[PDB]
Design a protein around this ligand. Structure first.
Ligand SMILES: CCC1=C(C)/C(=C/C2=NC(=C\c3[nH]c(/C=C4\NC(=O)[C@H](C)[C@H]4CC)c(C)c3CCC(=O)O)/C(CCC(=O)O)=C2C)NC1=O
Ligand SMILES: CCC1=C(C)/C(=C/C2=NC(=C\c3[nH]c(/C=C4\NC(=O)[C@H](C)[C@H]4CC)c(C)c3CCC(=O)O)/C(CCC(=O)O)=C2C)NC1=O
Ligand SMILES: CCC1=C(C)/C(=C/C2=NC(=C\c3[nH]c(/C=C4\NC(=O)[C@H](C)[C@H]4CC)c(C)c3CCC(=O)O)/C(CCC(=O)O)=C2C)NC1=O
Ligand SMILES: CCC1=C(C)/C(=C/C2=NC(=C\c3[nH]c(/C=C4\NC(=O)[C@H](C)[C@H]4CC)c(C)c3CCC(=O)O)/C(CCC(=O)O)=C2C)NC1=O
Ligand SMILES: CCC1=C(C)/C(=C/C2=NC(=C\c3[nH]c(/C=C4\NC(=O)[C@H](C)[C@H]4CC)c(C)c3CCC(=O)O)/C(CCC(=O)O)=C2C)NC1=O
Ligand SMILES: CCC1=C(C)/C(=C/C2=NC(=C\c3[nH]c(/C=C4\NC(=O)[C@H](C)[C@H]4CC)c(C)c3CCC(=O)O)/C(CCC(=O)O)=C2C)NC1=O
Ligand SMILES: CCC1=C(C)/C(=C/C2=NC(=C\c3[nH]c(/C=C4\NC(=O)[C@H](C)[C@H]4CC)c(C)c3CCC(=O)O)/C(CCC(=O)O)=C2C)NC1=O
Ligand SMILES: CCC1=C(C)/C(=C/C2=NC(=C\c3[nH]c(/C=C4\NC(=O)[C@H](C)[C@H]4CC)c(C)c3CCC(=O)O)/C(CCC(=O)O)=C2C)NC1=O
Ligand SMILES: CCC1=C(C)/C(=C/C2=NC(=C\c3[nH]c(/C=C4\NC(=O)[C@H](C)[C@H]4CC)c(C)c3CCC(=O)O)/C(CCC(=O)O)=C2C)NC1=O
Ligand SMILES: CCC1=C(C)/C(=C/C2=NC(=C\c3[nH]c(/C=C4\NC(=O)[C@H](C)[C@H]4CC)c(C)c3CCC(=O)O)/C(CCC(=O)O)=C2C)NC1=O
Ligand SMILES: CCC1=C(C)/C(=C/C2=NC(=C\c3[nH]c(/C=C4\NC(=O)[C@H](C)[C@H]4CC)c(C)c3CCC(=O)O)/C(CCC(=O)O)=C2C)NC1=O
Ligand SMILES: CCC1=C(C)/C(=C/C2=NC(=C\c3[nH]c(/C=C4\NC(=O)[C@H](C)[C@H]4CC)c(C)c3CCC(=O)O)/C(CCC(=O)O)=C2C)NC1=O
Ligand SMILES: CCC1=C(C)/C(=C/C2=NC(=C\c3[nH]c(/C=C4\NC(=O)[C@H](C)[C@H]4CC)c(C)c3CCC(=O)O)/C(CCC(=O)O)=C2C)NC1=O
Lengths: 172, 50, 101, 162, 162, 172, 163, 172, 162, 172
């Protein structure tokens, strides 16, 4: 399972060559923005309960059919599993955000998720909608400037957005 | 493989996990569940800007 | 018991031939053991990892929580093999896993 | 490959939890780690050729017999393969420096080293001595944090070989 | 779900044996107790509207502050969901009566109760108050033995919540 | 695993409504005839060796090619496997007769058994024939009026016949 | 898939993930030496199969008179035929075991599932024990020296499993 | 998992017949030549590291792409897996040679090796070439008369060639 | 309890192997981190009475219904127990600060939190927003990295209550 | 398994009070000198194999009865076991060094090692002697300041001596 440094190393070894000075410069810039990246990952970590709560509330406001008798989130058990899925996806997204590489999602979470959801009978578009709602919820907490040094981190916002979108696309 | 002391773990590099690929149920119809093409036929209990 | 079983008719799998350490260290699953049971937070993590290995992390619900087995384990009167077996020989494992399949 | 970040994530995932405080503190430690390690990697990448030539010559020097015909180290092809192997080791030490973890060395060099050496009759002491020469040379090339980090990874490789 | 018959069959099937005399005695007990339980289920089914509305009102009385603005009880939608949830609990109590087992409750209601209540911040005490109101009115609606059955199931739900 | 009561409950919950008085009356009638149902189930349970032995004798009179060298019941392990299969299917039929629903029989016994027999090379028509022979040898015992109160058990006889026919049709 | 000397050797070498050491090929040499008396016994026992089976059937009837009267297992031409067929099976698998130098044919083809089949069809193990005792007596004469011991080992194994 | 004796007995049993005079004579011949067979299996077992080293030397002389970076035997753990696979296949050939039947080789070793290699990305024709090189290296050790009584072993050489080719063709 | 050094030593002894680089110099990171954390602990230890007194009335402001008779907060003794509980939480935040890990807070507070809170019918939101007030007042008392430290540890406590 | 900070917190909780400023001062004094402790532990870790080789050589030198047959240290596997024991006790002393507490030493193995060595029959005074002499050998390496910046190391030496002698006195 690869982070950005290991991904660069794997590319270099496939070429069978030392790392370039340009690639070392890129990795050094990554290590420089690492503090901002840690702040974003910690924001997701702390705000995970509120993120999942907001996403669940909006999702079940939009799709009553899920929570109707016979729906895919009707009893307490299926709703609890739904919220567990939201937490699992948010957790793997935070993993990838820290590592700076989406290998965590693809390897551990999204490798066979659509086939699993089809086997269970789960509406997959609704899962993707929950992922997108979680993305919208998490952008608010990532943008929050309270108790954190002010700065520009739009690259991190775009990065987290593309991991959420990758998760949704692999699920949907 | 594990003995009396160790907890079971998948003997595969874990970049391809089991529990993700294998669910507890796969391709069965459930009694409490409802077919995806079907729709709920019961009390609406509210009208939220339908 | 009764009759003997059929023939296994093996097949080539990674676990069969693993004289060389795995490709990635972090990708080797964690080997929980008796020593992990000595601490307390370690014991909670061991219990959760057992529930995740057997019950698949979506059945980790307070209704599904075997408390008798956990207390026996915490005593030291229960082996890990017996804890795993007791999770397999449980009402939740029959009703949630065996019955559907 | 194993890294600070990668073991952080593996530990978090094993326990089915988000990254807590200590995990991010270790991540911060590695992020500050990177700079001296990356200068160490740049210095070793600049000076790869002299280091390889010195290591191969030292291996011949302290093992004079292998240089002679009828032995392992005789021949142009065998000595070119020696140079290539030392280049491999130096490259993977630089990889470990940049990754700030022994993931690359363990992944490529260490994993299965003994079986390959036994099958091809490659005496580990040659590579241990070449690593020792690299240790000495980077004793001159680097200083401060970078020297400590590079020596640490070279020592990891040496213990693995021995 | 889990009834007397289903536990009998599953216990036989888990030891891989035929249903023996003790299992048939338990099934006979179920078949004799079916009449009072079906009577209780019919009684609670006939008066479902009064029971649900009174339970919601008892919930509001016990916790007036919840219906204040900014709290969970304010708004037509939230009280409609209140009535819906109490209807769910009553429906599953009657299901458990007919099934003569707590299986319908243990599967539909109790399985995942803590996680869902904590996720949506639903106080269990609201539901315990509503179930206590249902418990009270069952005594008026039911006499003798069907009252005892309905009370067993409502008590099981209450203990599951608390 | 469902019985008649849980089947009714699940259907009602899918409709999202309480049980109708017609459904409760049906279940009351079921419970009232439950004692006769228990009699039939006990007749099947207590006479399992007799049923299996008679079915086996008849089957291996009709189909001798099973017990010839090169047949599918030739050695002792294969004959014991045959008798074991018959006992298992009789067990699940008795379960389904007590429950009142063929859900246990279909889910736990017959759901993938034809594929298994094909993978083992077993003649599925022979297995179906053995199941019909057990039907005959069983309804011999269910109709045994001796030692029990006389009454109309035609519904139970039809139910048992349907379960055995379902088994035979599923295997073949 | 039988449990023989060569195959037990191969299986215990495979389970340990190692080559065949000295002792494995060593026991294999023992088996290959063993085989000549075993094949001699199997030849001398397959040549006399029909007389052996006939004598065994008659000896079982002599030792168990009651089975012969009407209303018992032994009454009827068909039950006669199946008695002869069962004893022929036992003899054939004893010869198989002799040839294979192991109890794999008996333990797999006859012994496994023996009790269940006997119970279901109400077959008495003592009938076949008497038949095998008669066959043992006759192979006491038919075979000389090593071959007699080799045949008696497997007949005794079958008798022990019947009991 | 049968030796030649067990295949003889199983083929005989399927027909329901004893073992004939000719079959017993052939099996006695096999037992008599089992001495040569033990010599051959010992020659394989004793010299296994030498055989694997010779095969690897020749194979990476002829196919340098295996050991270059980006190759399939390069990263120095894939080299260990290469040599380990060679030793496994040599071990199973020795098993088969001792038994006299290629059953153990076919079932315990090659059952699903082709698709395993295809999923990994391993060039299967190169693996088959390595098996053929092991055959070539092992024939010399088999034909060594040192410390062994001179005799005819052409049949054993043919059998060993058959087993090595069976392994190679299964992989390829 | 659990600390970074404790994690290092337990992991190293579990595999029976000497310490690897990541372990050593993550312990280095902790050793450096000790300096701001201990200052944060001292700052939190100075003001404890004011923090607890503010927390109790912050709870009362946010949740008034707990004060009227028949509710948990009514009575002098119950409010004294409230103050004691908030003092416990603050002391364990300081303990986590000096320990550089959530260990003391996890074994001393989190371990068996939910069942105990449910048995005594203690609503966790009380403690949640009391901890929120404590976070707000650390918003002024502290400054610099120590600030973040305190905040995140309080973070963890909140994360575990919900 | 306790740290000096862990022990301080344990006593603070036992007395029920907050951590006193004197205790904080001593923790800060320990922490500011952390790199002291880390360099000592890391040098011990790196040079451990040489220490163990020297220790084995000498313990063979002064103590002779072991090496000949019949002693509690003749066999080769028994040599692997003895080397493992000396390695692990050195490692435990390293753990006590880094942690600053002996609870990580006393609790884990010293409790059971007593009855273990009583049951085995190997003398315990020899074990304590080997502990002391391996302490001396490791201390020699710990003196080595080369390749590292110079500084004081007396307190770490005192702590290491206390821990080595504590392990010996426990074993003895
Ligand atoms: C590796 C990481 C991982 C993931 C991602 C994962 C997803 C996952 N969710 C599951 C169940 C489920 N998943 C859902 C989720 C849906 N419900 C509603 O439709 C929502 C729209 C939607 C969620 C937002 C539900 C309701 C279930 C319950 C199905 C059941 O109980 O059978 C299952 C079936 C296994 C089981 O229940 O034991 C898996 C594998 N599992 C994993 O181990
Ligand atoms: C113990 C756990 C830990 C954390 C949490 C951590 C994060 C961290 N963030 C920092 C500053 C910062 N943090 C951010 C990121 C934020 N800026 C805001 O505007 C964005 C909403 C947000 C983006 C996610 C930025 C931009 C800086 C300024 C310094 C820099 O960019 O390098 C600093 C340097 C202190 C300073 O000079 O301000 C640290 C150490 N490090 C740790 O060891
Ligand atoms: C007991 C029967 C059995 C066999 C035989 C077997 C072989 C086997 N070889 C494997 C990998 C491998 N096999 C090879 C060998 C090939 N690659 C090069 O082309 C060489 C020329 C050539 C050797 C002749 C290599 C290099 C790998 C490693 C692939 C990887 O690590 O990604 C794997 C995948 C697991 C792993 O080792 O990582 C299996 C299962 N497994 C079994 O259960
Ligand atoms: C990823 C890291 C990696 C390593 C370390 C490695 C070792 C390595 N060195 C090799 C070649 C060789 N290596 C040596 C030994 C060297 N030559 C002598 O001059 C010196 C004394 C000595 C070095 C100090 C020789 C003589 C050969 C060619 C002959 C042979 O492979 O046996 C080979 C066999 C390649 C072939 O078959 O052509 C391996 C596997 N391979 C790897 O992929
Ligand atoms: C199997 C049976 C079952 C039950 C019992 C159940 C309860 C339940 N009620 C919910 C909403 C709700 N339920 C209530 C109930 C409150 N309303 C009044 O104020 C009262 C004080 C109190 C009821 C006594 C409220 C306020 C909500 C909205 C909570 C929110 O949206 O966050 C939700 C969240 C899902 C949604 O509808 O969007 C669940 C799961 N769900 C089930 O599938
Ligand atoms: C692998 C070798 C093998 C054996 C040994 C074997 C025994 C065997 N004998 C059978 C029939 C039988 N065999 C006998 C034997 C009796 N006949 C009397 O003359 C004697 C007293 C006595 C023999 C000494 C009898 C009575 C039956 C009929 C039992 C019945 O169907 O009720 C049957 C049931 C098949 C059928 O109904 O025809 C088996 C399985 N089957 C095998 O495949
Ligand atoms: C609870 C659902 C269920 C059932 C019932 C079931 C039956 C079953 N029958 C089997 C074999 C068998 N089944 C039979 C019986 C058939 N062949 C005879 O000719 C008869 C005509 C006929 C029976 C009436 C035989 C002879 C075998 C042995 C096949 C063999 O050993 O190769 C086997 C596998 C072989 C073993 O492990 O012993 C199973 C699992 N499996 C299930 O999961
Ligand atoms: C401990 C296990 C158990 C057994 C053994 C059992 C048998 C049983 N059967 C009964 C009546 C009965 N039993 C039967 C069944 C018979 N009708 C035909 O003759 C068939 C041959 C046969 C069933 C196929 C009938 C029809 C009744 C009377 C039904 C009624 O009066 O309601 C009764 C009640 C006596 C009565 O009604 O006066 C019992 C206890 N019940 C049990 O709980
Ligand atoms: C330690 C395990 C073990 C081994 C190894 C073994 C082999 C073995 N080979 C023998 C002779 C023999 N060995 C061979 C085989 C050789 N013929 C050709 O030279 C080939 C190069 C070569 C085999 C490939 C032959 C043909 C005989 C004589 C058999 C005959 O009469 O034709 C002998 C008898 C000669 C004596 O004892 O003096 C033995 C015991 N037996 C064992 O218990
Ligand atoms: C070291 C870890 C630790 C914690 C965290 C802790 C909290 C704690 N507070 C308790 C009592 C209590 N605590 C409260 C305080 C609540 N009610 C209001 O005043 C407030 C809004 C609110 C506090 C924020 C009350 C009312 C009780 C009495 C509960 C009862 O007896 O029914 C109890 C039960 C003890 C008893 O009932 O005798 C515990 C366990 N105790 C511990 O040992
Ligand atoms: C019976 C169980 C047993 C075994 C197996 C064993 C092997 C063994 N050989 C040793 C030393 C040795 N081994 C050798 C032999 C090798 N060194 C040179 O390179 C030679 C060229 C080469 C000989 C072919 C030598 C010379 C020593 C002496 C080293 C020393 O102690 O100074 C040692 C170190 C401790 C000692 O014996 O004093 C062991 C354990 N010892 C045992 O008690
Ligand atoms: C929990 C951590 C741990 C401890 C505490 C430990 C000590 C230990 N030493 C043992 C035997 C032993 N202990 C020794 C060492 C003694 N003999 C002489 O060399 C010396 C005087 C002295 C060492 C200085 C030896 C040589 C054995 C082997 C006895 C045998 O194999 O029969 C055993 C018995 C089981 C085994 O060796 O695997 C243990 C548990 N091992 C551990 O994994
Ligand atoms: C990879 C893990 C790691 C290591 C190995 C490490 C060693 C290390 N110790 C340092 C400070 C230092 N370290 C020491 C300790 C040394 N003095 C002597 O007595 C002994 C050889 C040894 C103690 C046993 C001293 C004296 C300083 C100078 C700062 C001071 O103590 O005032 C420095 C900063 C260099 C500088 O001052 O510019 C490093 C890199 N740091 C790390 O993060």
């Amino acid at each position: 399972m690869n982070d950005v440094f290991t991904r660069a190393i794997a590319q270099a070894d496939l070429k069978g060559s030392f790392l370039l000075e340009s690639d070392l410069d890129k990795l050094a810039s990554f290590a420089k923005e690492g503090v901002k990246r840690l702040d974003a990952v910690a924001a997701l970590t702390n705000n995970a309960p509120a993120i999942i709560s907001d996403a669940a509330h909006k999702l079940f406001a939009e799709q009553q059919e899920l929570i109707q008798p016979g729906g895919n989130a009707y009893p307490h058990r299926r709703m609890a599993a739904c919220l567990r899925d939201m937490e699992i996806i948010l957790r793997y997204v935070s993993y990838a955000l820290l590592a700076g590489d989406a290998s965590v999602l693809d390897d551990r979470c999204l490798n066979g998720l659509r086939e699993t959801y089809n086997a269970l009978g789960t509406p997959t578009q609704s899962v993707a909608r929950a992922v997108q709602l979680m993305k919208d919820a998490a952008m608010v907490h990532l943008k929050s400037t309270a108790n954190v040094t002010v700065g520009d981190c739009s690259s991190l916002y775009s990065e987290a957005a593309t991991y959420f979108d990758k998760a949704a696309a692999s699920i949907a | 493989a594990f003995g009396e002391d160790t907890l079971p773990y998948q003997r595969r590099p874990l970049s391809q996990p089991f529990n993700l690929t294998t669910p507890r149920l796969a391709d069965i119809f459930q009694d409490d569940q409802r077919s995806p093409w079907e729709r709920y036929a019961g009390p609406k209990f509210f009208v939220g800007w339908k | 018991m009764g009759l003997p079983l059929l023939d296994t008719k093996y097949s080539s799998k990674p676990h069969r031939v693993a004289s060389i350490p795995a490709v990635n260290a972090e990708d080797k699953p964690w080997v929980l053991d008796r020593y992990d049971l000595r601490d307390e937070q370690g014991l909670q993590s061991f219990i959760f990892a057992a529930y995740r290995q057997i019950f698949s992390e979506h059945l980790i619900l307070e209704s599904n929580r075997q408390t008798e087995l956990e207390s026996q384990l915490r005593n030291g009167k229960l082996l890990v093999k017996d804890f795993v077996r007791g999770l397999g020989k449980s009402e939740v494992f029959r009703r949630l896993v065996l019955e559907p399949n | 490959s194993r890294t600070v970040i990668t073991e952080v994530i593996a530990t978090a995932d094993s326990q089915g939890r988000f990254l807590n405080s200590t995990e991010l503190q270790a991540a911060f430690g590695r992020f500050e780690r990177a700079v001296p390690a990356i200068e160490a990697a740049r210095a070793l990448t600049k000076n790869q050729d002299a280091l390889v030539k010195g290591a191969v010559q030292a291996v011949f020097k302290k093992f004079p017999y292998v240089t002679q015909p009828g032995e392992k180290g005789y021949g142009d092809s065998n000595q070119a393969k020696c140079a290539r192997d030392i280049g491999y080791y130096l490259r993977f030490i630089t990889y470990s420096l940049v990754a700030s973890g022994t993931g690359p060395l363990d992944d490529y060099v260490i994993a299965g080293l003994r079986e390959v050496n036994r099958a091809f009759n490659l005496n580990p002491l040659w590579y241990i001595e070449a690593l020792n020469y690299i240790k000495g040379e980077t004793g001159k090339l680097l200083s401060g944090q970078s020297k400590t980090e590079a020596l640490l990874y070279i020592d990891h490789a040496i213990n693995a070989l021995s």
